[PDB]
Symmetry: C3
Subunit: 491 residues, 3 copies
């Protein structure tokens, strides 16, 4: 009869693409792409995500918390991600500031992108070092404390001096005060009122000049002294005064300069920030929601598959990455019993087949290992930069977008090439295995074997299920069927 | 006689490099590099390329079209690529503007980089909303229409008020007006003249102040009131007045502020732009020229080979990409009849050979498939970002150049590595094929063969042309030559 | 007796990782990672590195050399790398300039990053072309020459005209003057003094206005006229005047404008720079120290191994690149005499072994070739972009860091993948070799061979050391041992 080994044919259900064989029909395959479904925002499964600077604070917006307003002095917690849910934050709890006339509008979003936020316990510039020495910080008639007594902002001091008259100008210098690895943020401003008011509290009637130089540029301000826009973004009514503002940042080993004349509002406490973290644009949190990753287009999504297809957008957490077209991976053998590799005996005793389990387990193990190696591709991390904001200037934003687009395109192309290579490797390893089975088959058949050449052998005896289980198990001697075993090496 | 199979040797002509075997001489090779030849600029084979804003307009420059001058109101067509053929555009059809005193010089090049250009049907700021109620746009004695009647610009209104005196200042706010995915571009300015004139048309004799804040920064202007540079870039002679200009851009959900005093030239209609497209730096078009891709160094070039060697420069269309050094790909077999793989019989009847076509076609098919896969490398696309201009600031330009250089270097390295890998794979696949021929050879020779082991076999009979063509065709039985066929599987 | 061939087992000492086989114990391995040790700064083994602008000059700081001070006019040498050893360079040899009030502080660090530095032999704006014609450059009572005679700077001219009174304002234009591929740097300033003084030298008592426009932006200056900061950074004591400065840069085909009033200090000679080179941040040079590469974290380091593990920082020269985790490469065979591939004969004559050298040399050659190919990964170069400074603005610096980090992470991931692939390839090629030996073995045994199937063969005679050297050498005939040779191909 004829005994040989090979694979088992089956009905093909999927089609895969290689680099040399084109399209190959295979019985089974694994999908490595999916379409995410939208979901609400929530906390990451890894840690806390920040949406509001002071969740404990009530009646305070982000601008009030950033400005160190009285009755907005809560404790800021830590987080590993942030949501930018307001492109124009508002304030409601002190004297009116003309925010959309300088650059101090996007302050909370600047503080949003650091894990560690702490408030300075000192003062940016000593109060006893000014040119005109008898200076005090004037309490405001509007910004009352919790009890109701008048108070100042807390980070921006309304200054008054002993002298009342025209002044040529005074210059001051500011140095770094936070630690070595910390970012220092401060604010300073100017007071604007009617002509009669300034001549009563400052002694001048003409707009004054202020100059600020910092390791970000120069800024000249000569605020108008007269007609004002509408009164808004304040808790006090019938106010004839306005405040101009300007914020500055500093790193280790840096300094800046300020020149001013009558009507200057001095710096106070400052912010020390550290540990940059990513931020994403979306909506406010929803209670009791935990997701694997945050996507700026879909929301809270899981990661049931290493790659996904659909709209492209920023994401933070443990989520799939963009891929151009659907992909499939071979999970079986080429098409045309219990396992794939098996033996077969044909003759006048009908035809009888068996199965090998150890051999067929190795192929599945290799396929799983290759799948895991491909999966490992979506975890290139361990380098987080300071990043930039989202409403600064067109050129910077477009540069960031170009960088992200280049990265995404290159990663997608690499993924496609790797998929093709792995498909081809599996297809070839199948043939390797079927060949490797043949040498095993011929080792214990003796020298009376009459092999067909194409994997099949001829033997002069009949084989039954006992023969199949013997050759599969390994213990099979031709002698027990009556053919010569082999010559001993000992003459 | 002795019958075996193998490849047909040949004279080597080229040398190729692998990762393990060093330098290998092969009979034939395919070149994958070439040096392009320069050619004139022209239209892309895919679509239209834009060089002039209004090809139908006559007597108008790009500055006049961008400024919505009268008699320059043509239709702006669509295109997929642009050429920046003027780094300093000029104007000749209205009142003089001191362009190289602000930032409004590169206006046509700003409009050039969008596929869809459209002119607003409204007005940026309503004409009734100004603080002074009776306001009118004054026609100018210079900017005449086609007939000859006096006219205004059309995007910049000369404003005059009822009152004539010293004014503290007025502030206005500008909001987004184009659609969600459209970029809004507007311009505004101020009037400069001699001391005697302004006291008659505005009532002041001192330079005034203008302040503009936008999501690009702050801009303060106190134009001089006196000596003026020469009169140029205009169609009107003997004019004592000049105009200062400034342009601003806006996206969805954004706003800006303008504070001004006496002598302000208000905004009018604006531009809505969309669909960013790439631009390249070169010359004007030449009539009736169509090329495959546009290279900023060579011009219109074709793509006869996926890679090219030479100078590096920006390109738009379907063109090769930079490669460091020449490359070659194996297109044959190793060196030392009709096809390569074939049989041979040697004996007392001389030596007779045959050729196998089915196997020798498979190797060429695999080579072509690998070549196509490697060619597919140069089409990483499908993500175009807004990009930037060419005369903005040194740091931004150098950042763009750095990104492009890094991308090019990485692509060149990847291409070289892939070339080496494919060379080695092909050389090994040949050996695979010659081995696979041997099992085919031994299937139909029977059990009486006395194979040499090294691909050759010994049979005890002579072979003629019929023997060779029979074994190549496949139908060959030892029984017809008088040797035992095989043992039947049926006892 | 039984004769076969294979590898020699040995004691396993190292463990390596593949993509399918997991962890494999191997006899020998090669390490491709190391920890650098810090060392002093010095010159590169390739060329000269620049730390001081004029090493030959004595008594002059970098600011004085950049400002073309008298007695600081030495020759500037060439270099291939630069060290930024001062984040705040100082000056000590002329009239005081309020440096930290504009942007002219980091002038030496701007001249530092170009290989070719040359001082112009002309003048930026011809001195006989001003609005008021009788103009002169006033010598300073402070900035004396080496002899002691009064002198000017040499790059910045103190201007005085015939007229003395209020002036409306004057405008000048500056065009490119260096060659086509050269960067032009110029400086200009303004004079500040006390009120009574200017009325004696200029005829005014009020702060004046100066405006500069260049292809980098706008800059307006109205310096204060009165109380001054302390007197420092000069060689002259008891001086009541100060100078404000501003620097501008220009490329080919660019132009700029300056408007000024009374009290303007005019431009003089300028700088032409070319050939950008990289810079690193560190300390001053140490005499007689040469290293293979410069690392901004460790100092002068050598390159004993293509990859290194530890802290990440910028480097210049021929140095390794960052890698996440330690790596090892197979340098032997799988674990369980002179070489590894060898024969063995067993029988009643004990057991005897031999070694093959020609086969075992090929595996070493292949391993070394693959190692060289992997090493070649760390030489991606031949594209140097102009780069930027380190103290400009937060956004630009952060963008640079983002680009560098993206590059580093991608390179590390690629290196890891390639190491895994090469490990697998070597492990498989060993098995290839051991199989390939068997066909050679069976070629010269004759047709009476009784192969065991798994590489071993049975022969009917005894083999001695002579038999082993015969089979390894190749000359071995069964007839001289008493077996049939083969059937002759000629009937
Ligand atoms: C694989 O997933 C993609 C995307 O979800 C889908 O379009 C495709 O039909 C899926 N195919 C199979 C065989 O699962
Ligand atoms: C498909 O792959 C999975 C994952 O290894 C495996 O468990 C399963 O058996 C495969 N499919 C079939 C039909 O064997
Ligand atoms: C291949 O093309 C390059 C392109 O310049 C050329 O230098 C080289 O000589 C060519 N070689 C062959 C064999 O065609
Ligand atoms: C060279 O390659 C081309 C394209 O694959 C092929 O058509 C040609 O036959 C090859 N050369 C030879 C001599 O076969
Ligand atoms: C390989 O080098 C790394 C880098 O220092 C070291 O930690 C490791 O111990 C070394 N191992 C061997 C076997 O050389
Ligand atoms: C380790 O590799 C080197 C070169 O790669 C080789 O010279 C040496 O023989 C190898 N080690 C052993 C034990 O063979």
């Amino acid at each position: 009869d004829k005994i040989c080994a090979g694979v088992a044919s089956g009905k093909g259900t999927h089609r895969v693409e290689t680099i040399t064989k084109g399209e190959v029909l295979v019985t089974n395959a694994i999908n490595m792409t999916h379409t995410p479904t939208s979901g609400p925002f929530g906390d990451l499964k890894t840690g806390n995500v920040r949406d509001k600077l002071c969740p404990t604070c009530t009646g305070c917006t982000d601008m009030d918390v950033a400005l160190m307003t009285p009755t907005c002095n809560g404790v800021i917690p830590e987080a590993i991600a942030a949501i930018q849910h307001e492109n124009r934050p508002l304030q409601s709890k002190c004297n009116p500031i003309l925010h959309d006339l300088g650059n101090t509008r996007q302050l909370p979003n600047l503080l949003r992108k650091y894990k560690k936020i702490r408030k300075s316990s000192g003062i940016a510039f000593p109060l006893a070092s000014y040119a005109d020495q008898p200076v005090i910080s004037n309490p405001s008639g509007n910004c009352r404390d919790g009890n109701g007594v008048e108070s100042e902002f807390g980070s921006l001091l309304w200054l008054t001096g002993n002298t009342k008259g025209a002044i040529t100008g005074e210059t001051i210098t500011i140095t770094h005060q936070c630690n070595n690895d910390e970012v220092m943020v401060l604010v300073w401003g100017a007071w604007a009122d009617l002509s009669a008011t300034m001549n009563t509290i400052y002694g001048v009637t003409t707009p004054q000049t202020y100059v600020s130089n910092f390791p970000s540029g120069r800024f000249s301000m000569s605020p108008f002294l007269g007609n004002f826009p509408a009164l808004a973004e304040t808790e006090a009514t019938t106010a004839t005064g306005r405040i101009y503002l300007r914020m500055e940042v500093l790193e280790s080993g840096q300094r800046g300069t300020i020149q001013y004349q009558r009507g200057f509002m001095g710096p106070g406490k400052f912010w020390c920030l550290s540990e940059p973290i990513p931020v994403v644009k979306g909506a406010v949190k929803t209670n009791g929601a935990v997701s694997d990753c945050l996507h700026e287009v879909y929301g809270g999504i899981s990661k049931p598959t290493p790659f996904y297809t659909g709209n492209r957008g920023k994401s933070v957490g443990n989520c799939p990455k963009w891929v151009r077209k659907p992909l499939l991976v071979v999970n079986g053998t080429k098409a045309r019993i219990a396992g794939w590799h098996g033996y077969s005996s044909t003759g006048d005793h009908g035809t009888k087949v068996a199965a090998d389990l150890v051999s067929t387990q190795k192929a599945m193990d290799a396929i799983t290992a290759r799948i895991n190696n491909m999966n490992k591709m979506t975890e290139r991390a361990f380098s987080v930069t300071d990043s930039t904001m989202q409403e600064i200037q067109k050129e910077i934003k477009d540069l960031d977008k170009k960088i992200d687009d280049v990265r995404a395109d290159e990663t997608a192309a690499q993924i496609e090439m790797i998929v093709l290579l792995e498909n081809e490797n599996i297809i070839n390893a199948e043939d390797e295995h079927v060949h490797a089975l043949k040498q095993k088959l011929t080792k214990m058949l003796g020298p009376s074997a009459q092999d067909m050449g194409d994997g099949c052998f001829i033997v002069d005896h009949q084989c039954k299920e006992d023969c199949l289980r013997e050759i599969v198990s390994g213990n099979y001697t031709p002698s027990k069927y009556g053919m010569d075993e082999f010559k001993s090496p000992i003459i």
